């Protein structure tokens, strides 16, 4: 199957024409949308969503990742194969930073084989359709990785500050605010569990000049409605939520904001 | 096929990872999205959308319904088989109230068979992925209903006031406001047709302290642009619309608001 | 495959029930969404999106186009076969104006064969589900075009002013503003290239009483961030964009607005 992720939105016909290209190459391709609502040009956001979503895709899944503000420039077009046997077709702009780091990379190929393109003359601003999508289609059909082009020994990396436990607390950043307003961080719940806390315990959440108390819970329903809670989200990351409410609003925080969890 | 309905939104990667789980279990599963834009935690809204959409799905369709604010709590996870031979995989929070009432229930099973789960250790807040979705996948693949777990003799019901015809009028509630602003009620068009009215007749619509006149019509185009009309929507429910306009705005009404249709 | 385009939105269960009808008729149907976010009743917008998207669909693709404010009225329901061998199932309201003009029409059939319908008694306001969708399904399954109904010798056309090159400049209109804010016109990039301009050249963009200078470029990245550029979009149309910005905001323009490109 193909894991599809972009910042194109579902309003435009872009996603659709990309899917038609894939289907023309391989009518049996299974295209699963991770999301096409990554904020415009937000590769950082895509890098996290990509990793988190990939955890539930099987090995040998071909990911088509296109948040590519540098489309048509000298930036490289690449295919990365990670050590957990997954493949990623994307621009070399750092969007594959998280999967590379978390999974480790087995090999990287630069997209050079023009026989794999949709059109002999690729448009300058829509490689998603003319290059990436058709390459993902071929790979998902069984094209050997080496037929993509030459190997690359390096790739662009996005700078990321690794969250740590210092002085009974863990400092991190808001990685993703979902539609419910839940606030997921880049702080692994295992790391948090190093402050020697446990479910039913109460901790402190510091955002900006604000400080809140919050129960460590398993389910939203574990606290009264409207109350705050700290818990492991579906991907193993520490998330702050308001039971039947919007934590992003209560905390008044946005993606990228620094967050501190104190015992 | 699988009818998929949630309040997760399409912006998050949630819908996607759920679909990947289904596809991993059964690559041939046909997943049709009813909608993933039910307002957060709005089971009432989902219960109506579910019923209305189910009318066009064939018998033996497996519905995956996940608007589950009580995820991870003692609330039961169930599979309901209705008398029209459709199946519903959902939380026992009343979201299956309308199909149960309208179709009648043949049997209910509590989800207990852990061999049907996606993960041996289900996350606390995303049973949609770890329990419901994989159970729907197995059922759609032909798993006998009894393999799901033990039978249940009752289920949670949402309180709903049945609309009636009293004194040349029918009182009801706004069930769904669609993207055009059309205002669909919970009033069956057949019931309305008891006030001895007919197409081309004019009736009165009362909302709040407001009263409007509206023609009973078949098509929006049956009245001048901007005019109000009362008609049967695609599911047989009385709906109020503005031809080439937004009735929710003109009436200034929202879902749940009481509505009165007077001869 | 079936190219699906409507103004129904993805929030409602409408798109879903239409897809279930198609799948019931032909479980092997490949439904590719072009977009369901065309503004309500905006056939003009749909006519352009349709054409632009069709360029990447293969010949023999069956397009299901339903932006039908006149649903249930005397307006005809038709199937148009163009000279590039594509088929379009739609209301005869002018939504097929652009493909007809650009591709030329080989034949038009009025939908008359009721054996092709979803329901013996079609709803008055949702022919998308009861007539169009099932007809598209049958055609995609191989139903000969003549079985649809009698031939029609004419069809509704939307009035459109053809952009031209007069006095070193080209006047046109904004056809589509995408999610990035890019401003695509109805001006073919080939026509623009008649003003004897070339990449790296600078031209003038006139909107309203405003005038801007903009570089003619290939990729957004070809200019500094925040700068304006004129380039050919993925469909060959002249588009104005802001590198890593929103041109619709900078120009303060909307679809339908007249635009002038001066040497
Ligand atoms: N105005 C723009 N400036 C820079 N990049 C853009 C712009 N519009 C679209 N893109 C990029 O084009 C890519 C698709 O080819 C998208 O991933 C998007 O990030
Ligand atoms: N902050 C929250 N409070 C209560 N329930 C939530 C919250 N966020 C998500 N959910 C529920 O989690 C379910 C998916 O596991 C969704 O159906 C949603 O209703
Ligand atoms: N209030 C309305 N007035 C006119 N047309 C409408 C209205 N609501 C929905 N439609 C049309 O119904 C069609 C689907 O049957 C849509 O394409 C839409 O354009």
Nearest to B103 by CA among B149, B172, B139, B53: B53
Domain harbouring A35, CATH code:
3.40.50.10790
Number of residues in chain A: 263
Query: Which burial class, exposed, middle or buried, applies to B115 when counting CB atoms under 10 A from its CB (0-12, 13-18, 19+)?
Result: exposed
Tokens read off for B263: 């001869």
Rounded Cα distance, C155 and B149, in Å: 59
Q: What is the DSSP letter of B220?
A: G
- Tokens representing residue B96 in the block: 């299956």
Q: How far is CA C212 from CA A182, C175, C244, in A?
A: 43, 19, 18
Q: Specify whether the CB–CB gap between B222 and B171 falls below 8 A.
A: no
Instruction: Choose among A163, A258, A162: nearest CA to A210.
Output: A258
Cα Rg of chain C, angstroms: 20
Q: Residue B202 is inside which H or E element, if any?
A: strand B202-207
Torsion of CA A96, A100, A105, A110, to 10 degrees: 20
Buried b (16+ CB within 10 A) or exposed e, B43-72: bbbbbbbbbbbbebbeeebbbbbbbbbbbb
C-beta of residue B62 within 8 angstroms of C-beta of residue B140: yes
B119 shares its domain with B173:
no
Decide: helix, strand or coil at residue A261.
strand
Among C177, C156, C149, C165, residue whose Cα is nearest residue C250:
C177
Output helix, strand, coil percentages for chain B, rounded to the nearest 5. 25, 30, 45
Look at C221 and A73 and tell me if their CB atoms are within 8 Å.
yes
Q: Assess whether C173 and C90 both reside in one domain.
A: no
Mark out the alpha helices in B78-132 (DSSP H runs).
97-103, 127
**Can you state the percent helix, strand and coil of chain C, rounding each to 5?**
25, 30, 45
Same domain, B11 and B47: yes
Alpha-carbon dihedral sign for residues C205, C207, C212, C218: negative
Cβ distance B13 to A244 less than 8 Å, yes or no, reads: no
Residue among A12, A71, A73 whose CB faces C179 most closely: A12
Tokens of B120: 């041996």
What is the rounded CA–CA span in Å between residue A62 and residue A96? 13
Last residue of a domain, one of C107, C136, C158: C158
CB within 6 Å of ligand 2 — which residues? A 180, 182, 220, 241-244; B 6-7, 41, 66-69, 71, 125-128
How far apart (Å, rounded) are the C-alpha atoms in residues B31 and B57? Answer: 12
Residue ranges of alpha helices (H) inside chain A are: 14-25, 43-54, 97-103, 127, 133-140, 189-192, 247-251
Q: Which member of B24, B41, B69 has the closest CB to residue A58? A: B24
Q: What angle do helix axes C14-25 and C133-140 make, rounded to 10 degrees? A: 40
CB C135 within 8 A of CB C89: yes
Mark which of C132, C158, C184 sits at the end of a domain.
C158
Considering the domain architecture, whether residues A57 and A180 belong to the same structural domain is answered as: no
- Is C13 in the same domain as C70? yes
**B194 phi and psi, to 5 degrees?**
-90, -20
Cβ–Cβ under 8 Å, residues C156 and C94: yes
Q: Which of B176, B177, B180 to mutate to test the pocket of ligand 3 (most atoms within 8 A of CB)?
A: B180
Question: How far from C36 is each of A13, C42, C137, CA to CA, in Å?
Answer: 9, 12, 18
A244 annotated as ligand-binding: yes
A111 with A77: CB under 8 angstroms?
yes
Inter-chain touch A58–B20, beta carbons under 8 Å: yes
Distance from the CA of C59 to the center of ligand 3, in angstroms?
Answer: 29
CB A92, CB A76: distance < 8 Å:
yes
B20/A35 touch (CB, cutoff 8 Å), yes or no: no
Q: Is B6 annotated as a binding residue?
A: no
Check CB contact under 8 Å for B33 and C16: yes
CB count in 10 Å sphere of residue A103:
20
Comparing CA positions, the residue from C159, C182, C183, C187 lying closest to residue C171 is: C187
Chains in contact with B, where contact requires at least 3 CB pairs less than 8 Å apart: A, C
Q: Which helix (H) or strand (E) holds B31?
A: strand B31-35
Q: Which two tokens stand for residue B260?
A: 């009165």
Angstrom CA distances, B100 to B21, B105, C184, stand at 27, 5, 50
Residues A180 and A149 in one domain: no
Phi, psi (deg, nearest 5) at residue B229: -150, 155
Separation between Cα atoms, residue B246 and residue B225, nearest integer Å = 11
Q: Any idea what DSSP says for residue B132?
A: I
How far is the first Cα of chain B from the last one, in angstroms, to the nearest whole number? 43
> CA-CA distance, A80 to A82, in Å (whole number)?
6
Rounded CA-CA distance B91/B168 in Å is: 40
Check if the beta carbon of residue A127 is closer than 8 Å to that of residue A68: yes
Largest Cα–Cα separation, chain B: 61
Pure H helices in chain B = 14-25, 43-54, 97-103, 127, 133-140, 189-192, 247-251
CB B176 within 8 A of CB B222: no
Task: Tell me the C-alpha distance between B231 and B220, whole Å.
Answer: 9
Under an 8 Å CB criterion, which residues of C touch A?
A: 1, 3, 5, 10, 30, 32-37, 49, 52-53, 55-58, 61, 178-180, 218-222, 231-234, 244
Torsional sign, CA A95, A99, A101, A106:
negative
For C188, residues 6+ apart whose C-beta sits below 8 A from its C-beta are C163, C236, C237, C238
- Whether C86 is in the pocket of ligand 1, judged by its Cβ within 6 Å, is no
B26: burial class by Cβ within 10 Å (0-12, 13-18, 19+)? middle
> d(Cα B97, Cα B100) in Å, to the nearest integer?
5
How far is C-alpha A73 from the geometric centre of its chain's CA atoms? 23
H or E segment to which residue A218 belongs: none
- Among A135, A158, A181, the domain-final residue is A158
Give the pocket of ligand 3 (CB within 6 Å): B 180, 182, 220, 241-244; C 6-7, 41, 66-69, 71, 125-128
Residue C205, domain CATH? 2.40.30.90
A191 and A77 part of one domain:
no
Q: Hey, what are A237's tokens?
A: 């990351």
Contact status, residue A228 vs residue A259, Cβ threshold 8 Å: no
| A20 and A107 assigned to the same domain | yes
Secondary structure class of A202 (helix, strand, coil): strand
Q: Does ligand 1 have an atom closer than 6 angstroms to the CB of A212? A: no
> How does DSSP assign A115-182, residue by residue?
GGSSSSS--SS-HIIIIIHHHHHHHHTT--GGGG--B-S-------PPPEE-SSEEEEEEEEE-TT--
Residue B229 contacts residue B241 (beta carbons within 8 Å): yes
Interface size between A and B, measured as CB pairs under 8 A: 88
d(CA A188, CA A190): 5
Q: Are A111 and A75 in contact (CB under 8 A)?
A: no
Give the CA count within 13 Å in the CB-facing half-sphere of C238. 31
Say how many Å lie between the CA of residue A227 and the centre of ligand 2: 14
Which residue out of B241, B245, B247, B250 has the highest number of ligand 3 atoms within 8 Å of its CB and is therefore the one to mutate? B241
Determine the Cα–Cα distance for residues A68 and A90; give it in Å rounded to an integer: 8
C224: alpha, beta or left, given left = phi > 0 and alpha = psi -120 to 50?
A: beta
Helices and strands, number each (H, E), in chain C: 7, 14
What's this structure's resolution in Å? 2.1
C92 is in an annotated binding site: no
Distance CA B188, CA B225 (A): 25
C-alpha distances out from residue B197 to B36, B144, B168, B203, B230, Å: 37, 48, 10, 8, 11
Residue pair C84/C59 in contact by the 8 Å Cβ criterion: yes
- DSSP labels, B222-263: GS-TT-EEEEE-TTSEEEEEETTB-HHHHHT--TT-EEEEE-
Supply the residue whose CA is at minimum distance from atom 10 of ligand 2: B69
Chains with 3+ CB–CB pairs under 8 A to A are: B, C
Residue B178, both tokens: 């669609």
Judgement on whether residues B77 and B204 belong to the same structural domain of the protein? no
Identify the burial level of C100 via C-beta atoms within 10 angstroms of its C-beta, where 0-12 means exposed, 13-18 middle and 19 or more buried: buried
Cβ proximity of C72 and C12 under 8 Å: no
Pull the structure tokens for residue B23: 């596809």
Atom of ligand 3 nearest to the CA of C67: 17
Which secondary-structure segment (H or E) carries C30?
A: none
Distance from CA of C19 to the nearest CA of B (A): 7
Q: Which long-range contacts (CB under 8 A, 24 or more apart) does B51-55 make?
A: B51/B98, B51/B99, B51/B102, B52/B176, B52/B235, B52/B237, B52/C13, B53/B3, B53/B5, B53/C13, B53/C16, B53/C17, B54/B3, B54/B86, B54/B99, B54/B103, B55/B235, B55/C17
Residue with tokens 């149309």: C237
Torsion sign (Cα): C111, C117, C121, C124: negative
Q: How far is the CA of A175 from the centre of ligand 3 (A)?
A: 40
Contact C126, C21 (CB under 8 A): no
Long-range contacts of B160-163 (CB under 8 A, 24+ apart): B160/B97, B160/B186, B163/B187, B163/B188, B163/B191
In angstroms, the Cα distances linking A202 to A195, A215, A261 are 12, 4, 11
Quick check: CB of A125 below 6 Å from ligand 1?
yes
Between CA C128 and CA A101 the distance in angstroms is: 48
Cβ contact A141:A26 at 8 Å: yes
DSSP C207-233: ETTEEEEEEE-SSGGGS-TT-EEEEE-
How far apart (Å, rounded) are the C-alpha atoms in residues A256 and C70?
Answer: 48
Question: And the tokens for B87?
Answer: 């199946």
User: Coil, helix or strand for C258?
Assistant: strand
Q: How many CA atoms lie within 13 A of C150 on its CB side?
A: 4
Q: C-alpha distances in angstroms, C88 versus B199, B211, C4, C64?
A: 33, 43, 10, 6
- For chain B, how many structural domains are there in total? 2
Count CA within 13 A, CB hemisphere, residue C1: 24
Contact in structure between B50 and B4 (CB atoms under 8 Å): no
Beta bridge partners of B166: none
Query: Cα C141 to chain center, whole Å?
Result: 24
CA distance C103 to C243: 33
Length of chain B, in residues: 263
In this structure, the answer to whether residues C182 and C67 fall within a common structural domain is no
Question: Do B182 and B139 share a structural domain?
Answer: no
Q: What are phi and psi of B208, to 5 degrees?
A: 60, -125
H or E segment to which residue B96 belongs: none
Structural tokens at position C13 = 């269960």
Which ligand is located closest to the Cα atom of residue B250?
A: 3
User: Do B22 and B137 sit in the same domain of this protein?
Assistant: yes
* Distance, CA of A131 to CA of A136 (rounded, Å): 9
Q: Provide the residue range defining the domain that includes C10.
A: 2-158
């Amino acid at each position: 199957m193909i894991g599809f992720l972009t910042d194109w939105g579902l309003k435009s016909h872009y996603v659709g024409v990309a899917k038609a290209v894939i289907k023309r190459i391989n009518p049996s391709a299974e295209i699963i949308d991770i999301t096409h609502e990554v904020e415009p040009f937000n590769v950082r956001k895509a890098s996290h969503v990509l990793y988190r979503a990939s955890l539930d895709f099987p090995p040998s899944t071909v990911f088509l990742v296109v948040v590519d503000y540098g489309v048509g420039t000298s930036r490289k077009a690449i295919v990365m194969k990670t050590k957990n046997d997954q493949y990623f077709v994307a621009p070399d702009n750092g969007v594959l930073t998280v999967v590379a780091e978390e999974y480790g990379v087995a090999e990287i190929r630069e997209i050079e084989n023009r026989e794999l393109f949709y059109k002999k003359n690729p448009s300058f601003t829509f490689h998603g359709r003319d290059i990436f999508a058709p390459v993902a289609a071929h790979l998902d059909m069984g094209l050997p990785l080496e037929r993509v082009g030459d190997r690359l020994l390096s790739y662009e990396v996005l700078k990321m500050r690794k969250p740590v436990v210092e002085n009974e607390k863990v400092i991190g950043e808001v990685a993703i605010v979902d539609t419910f307003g839940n606030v997921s961080t880049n702080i692994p719940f295992d790391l948090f569990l190093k402050l020697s806390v446990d479910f039913d315990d109460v901790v402190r959440v510091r955002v900006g000049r604000k400080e809140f108390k919050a129960a460590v819970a398993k389910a939203f329903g574990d606290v009264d409605t409207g109350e705050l809670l700290v818990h492991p989200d579906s991907a193993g990351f520490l998330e702050i939520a308001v039971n039947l409410g919007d934590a992003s609003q209560v905390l008044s925080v946005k993606e990228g904001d620094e967050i501190e969890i104190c015992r």
